[model samples]
Target: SLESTASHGLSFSPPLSVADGVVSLDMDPYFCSQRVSLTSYSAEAQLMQFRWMARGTNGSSDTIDMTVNAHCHGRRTDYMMSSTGNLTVTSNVVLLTFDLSDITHIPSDLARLVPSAGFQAASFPVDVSFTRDSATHAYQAYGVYSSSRVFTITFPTGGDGTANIRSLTVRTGIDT
Candidate 1:
């Protein structure tokens, strides 16, 4: 369940534990003129999954949390992280896919996702950034860990307008 707002910026908070299978998280934006498709695809925002290998103070291993940041036109805008997955010790990766091909308006909501519009291109492509908590592994520009617990994938709002997410898949180590 998402709360709609008139303000341009919107924030999301996911439940700690989510049931298995596809979860449809919706966001109702302010504008509704032009529609656009904002899928989490393309070379910049590849479809991949991450695991969280959490190391307890006693050295016991557990999956902590797999969360990554999405930089829209070079700005830290949204984060995609999930804590719902099978428990494991070693690193396990999953490939989750979310295709927003149903998005109709793009130009009107472009500015909401990407701060700068019409500067270089017509719109800002969804750029994904994967980062791990310090308790799990070192933070770098696209580093993969050997131990992973949970992970999530997120897409940005098409500017200020609302977007309908067609589908989202949360499965482990199937395809990337």
Candidate 2:
């Protein structure tokens, strides 16, 4: 600071001048605790099936594995179940829905079915639908392709089935 009355009789200041008279301040925006939810409903006959066909570059070969699990929270009722096995182009009972009325959230389009080495042509028709909010609203995520042909299938921890499934009808975990 240039002291008044020549306290130092020198030329110095508290607010230093910027080089080339250029000063810029940047501020980044921050958001706290924000979540996204998709609301939809396709209430059905307690069955979320995964059916497909198996055809290899050679023939019907190679074992592509998968494990399905499901859980639903509804009005005064909860349902949960799981099935594990070697999957192919067709499957069944990937999820089960025993609802007392309507579900608030569930998995529709979840994981990518890992393919096998012999994968040449097949079909994947797994489109799950449920509500992520009130029963009145419905969101249908056509995640799993209905008639898809993979070149093979996959998971992180070694192989078989460990899909990062967030919801096979709320597939993170099978609980109430």
Task: Compute each candidate's TM-score over C-alphas.
Answer: 0.18, 0.17
Candidate 2 lDDT over 90-154, as tens digits, reads: 12112222221122233352221222222213332233332212232123221121222222211
**How many residue-pair clashes does candidate 2 contain?**
27
Q: TM-score for model 2?
A: 0.17
Show the lowest summed lDDT stretch of 10 residues, model 1.
167-176
In candidate 1, residue 55 scores what lDDT? 25
Off by over 4 Å in 2: 1-45, 48-61, 64-153, 157-176
Model 1 TM: 0.18
Tens-place lDDT per residue, model 1, 1-176, is 45557545534456322345344343222211123553332223222223322222211133233332233322223434444333222222322322222122322323323222222222223333222321232112221222121222222211222222111212222111
Off by over 4 Å in 1: 1-76, 87-98, 101-135, 143-176
RMSD of each: 22.7, 18.8
